[PDB]
Amino acid sequence: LYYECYSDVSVHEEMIADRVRTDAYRLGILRNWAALRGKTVLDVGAGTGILSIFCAQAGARRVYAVEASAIWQQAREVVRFNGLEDRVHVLPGPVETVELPEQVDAIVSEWMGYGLLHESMLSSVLHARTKWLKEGGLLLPASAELFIVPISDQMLEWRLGFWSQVKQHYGVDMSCLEGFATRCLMGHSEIVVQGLSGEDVLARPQRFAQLELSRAGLEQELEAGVGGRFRCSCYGSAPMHGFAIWFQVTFPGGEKPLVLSTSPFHPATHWKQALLYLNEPVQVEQDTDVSGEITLLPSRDNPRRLRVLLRYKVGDQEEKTKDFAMED
Amino acid sequence: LYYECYSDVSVHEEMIADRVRTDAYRLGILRNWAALRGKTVLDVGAGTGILSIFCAQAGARRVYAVEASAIWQQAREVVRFNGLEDRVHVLPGPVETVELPEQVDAIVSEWMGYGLLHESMLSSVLHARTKWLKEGGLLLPASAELFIVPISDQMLEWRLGFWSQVKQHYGVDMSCLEGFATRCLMGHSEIVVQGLSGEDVLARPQRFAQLELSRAGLEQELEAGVGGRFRCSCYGSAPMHGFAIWFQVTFPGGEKPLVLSTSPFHPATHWKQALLYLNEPVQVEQDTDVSGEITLLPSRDNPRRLRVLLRYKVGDQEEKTKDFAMED
Ligand SMILES: Cc1cc(C)cc([C@@H]2c3cc(C)ccc3NC(=O)CN2C(=O)c2ccc(Br)s2)c1
Ligand SMILES: Cc1cc(C)cc([C@@H]2c3cc(C)ccc3NC(=O)CN2C(=O)c2ccc(Br)s2)c1
Ligand SMILES: Nc1ncnc2c1ncn2[C@@H]1O[C@H](CSCC[C@H](N)C(=O)O)[C@@H](O)[C@H]1O
Ligand SMILES: Nc1ncnc2c1ncn2[C@@H]1O[C@H](CSCC[C@H](N)C(=O)O)[C@@H](O)[C@H]1O
């Protein structure tokens, strides 16, 4: 032990324990064997190196596994231990300053998530694409999509209703603290990462963004942000708590693309979903129109904030703005 | 909303959701009705005020509910809403500077837990006892005990063995990372608060400390720390990961005292147990002697550290020191 790495292994554990994430990258890379066999790959942020080894198993001649931080040591060890040190070169330090001997045929990466770490990871992948990817080279995954839907969070409803139950259980009335609990759990301006199920979803999810990660201009385009309008119609009576946002990414086939989805209707992943809570619950009914506009604006100046701008309208309520920010 | 209180309500929620904690204080206070009826109580750190209202229901004439932080507003509201503002006076600010009109017959408090917050809470209760409690006054709870036992953490064993499973699932060998995982999860010097079950316990738990909270000298005595020797004998074959520590507190009866226990053999509480991990697992067998000495030393100088000093011997292994610290 050099450094306290309790929080370290927990993140790498979470990723390898996620069978949806790991099978999607496994099957997604193997389905591209004809495009990878005898070719060169850059793995941007190789971590413990599993994506680099999947690329070798798919037939890559050379994999450059680039890892900025201390986990590079473990990637070095995993590669050696699988007898792949001739084929997979684990390189220390940031991809922005790495020197490869050649441009590569493919870039594999795992940048996706919510917050500044993932914003910077996407910027690092696009920097590597501009600098190192051959004309017409392959990106895995190739594209990303974002979805939004109105939600009723069953877990939040239990927590808000908890204070009304104290009188029955103990014989003291604490129902007067529902307002306090509501302001505390819903009244803030932070994104809450929490896993929902299908029955929390109040309407058809709407796609509001789609990024083709190979596009020449994408770095300059991201500067203006990602977003769109949405409109949907509620299924039934529910207390609406706000919106869920989630992503899917696509790996091209041999064939149909493989889709890695983080939707509440899909098997649970370590990514869960990003929840945007309204200041308080709003009752919806069958056919209640929910519309708005969502914009994600990149961080620019220190102290970095990724801004989430929401303007929305529930049924006959007036249009409302609620803006959120991520500061890690 | 004035302040982000997402982390706020989560702690008050955790406490009221804990039926073991809440029933112990409920039944513990009511069993003292004959000692409380027509008497005065100081509630040190009243929070949302439930312990102050339990004291009123037990027949207290006057309860001074003292709360240093912003949750005082909610305690004020809960008291008013239960029609007890004539009997329960919610006073803002630290107990060290509160002015009561009289010495009190009883002090109720909920100081127990692991870390500097709980060390300072115990110092605040003992300050209030010295300053405000009448000669022969009642403390609820009246005493505290600490226990230690060797443990095999089933959850830690799964996590350490996880890396050896990757080859079967995905077809890549990551067993070489068991050592890394072990150093990360066990090699640190922090106390881990985690809930165990009875089957994790490898021997008979040993009591190493007992505090009578009414004792005149206790404040000066705590300065030298709390601790003792222990000896026990393992039940069977297991990978020993370290020691668990937990507490119980006692509320005197009318009758036999009520004991609030946080033992792994007892119903789960929000306190869980405090785990002291060895640097790596040690195999024990039926009748393996485990002995040592545990000392808790108070924080003194900034930056505050509560020190946990452990010297122990497992079977025929040499005696070893592993010291821990809590810095929040
Ligand atoms: C997975 C994902 C896909 C896409 C298309 C974008 C984003 C999005 C993001 C946003 C910008 C402006 C730039 C880059 C960028 N990259 C990220 O990985 C970080 N990210 C996020 O933190 C958010 C997504 C949804 C919410 Br609510 S916050 C995340
Ligand atoms: C519940 C409990 C009971 C007793 C008798 C003590 C302690 C103990 C503690 C220790 C000192 C020196 C002074 C005060 C004091 N107070 C506390 O509430 C905080 N506390 C702790 O954080 C720890 C207990 C076990 C471990 Br491992 S750490 C905790
Ligand atoms: N600019 C950069 N250059 C290189 N590595 C980077 C980087 N920014 C972040 N990273 C690394 O990217 C990794 C992403 S998480 C690890 C993912 C990896 N595919 C795996 O299977 O483990 C982290 O380990 C982080 O240290
Ligand atoms: N020196 C001090 N004087 C007064 N209150 C204090 C204090 N130190 C801590 N506190 C308060 O003690 C409380 C302990 S947690 C709340 C426990 C309370 N019995 C309940 O049922 O809610 C916290 O709300 C904290 O703000």
From Swiss-Prot, chains A, B:
It is found in: Nucleus. Highly expressed in kidney and testis. Its main location: nucleus. Pfam families: Methyltransf_25, PRMT_C. Keywords: Chromatin regulator, DNA damage, DNA repair, Host-virus interaction, Methylation, Methyltransferase, Nucleus, Phosphoprotein, Repressor, S-adenosyl-L-methionine, Transcription, Transcription regulation, Transferase. Coiled coil: none annotated. The keyword Magnesium does not apply. S-adenosyl-L-methionine binds at H12, R21, G45, E67, E96. Signal peptide: none annotated. Belongs to the class I-like SAM-binding methyltransferase superfamily. Protein arginine N-methyltransferase family. PRMT6 subfamily. Arginine methyltransferase that can catalyze the formation of both omega-N monomethylarginine (MMA) and asymmetrical dimethylarginine (aDMA), with a strong preference for the formation of aDMA. Preferentially methylates arginyl residues present in a glycine and arginine-rich domain and displays preference for monomethylated substrates. Specifically mediates the asymmetric dimethylation of histone H3 'Arg-2' to form H3R2me2a. H3R2me2a represents a specific tag for epigenetic transcriptional repression and is mutually exclusive with methylation on histone H3 'Lys-4' (H3K4me2 and H3K4me3). This is Protein arginine N-methyltransferase 6. The lineage of its organism: Eukaryota, Metazoa, Chordata, Craniata, Vertebrata.
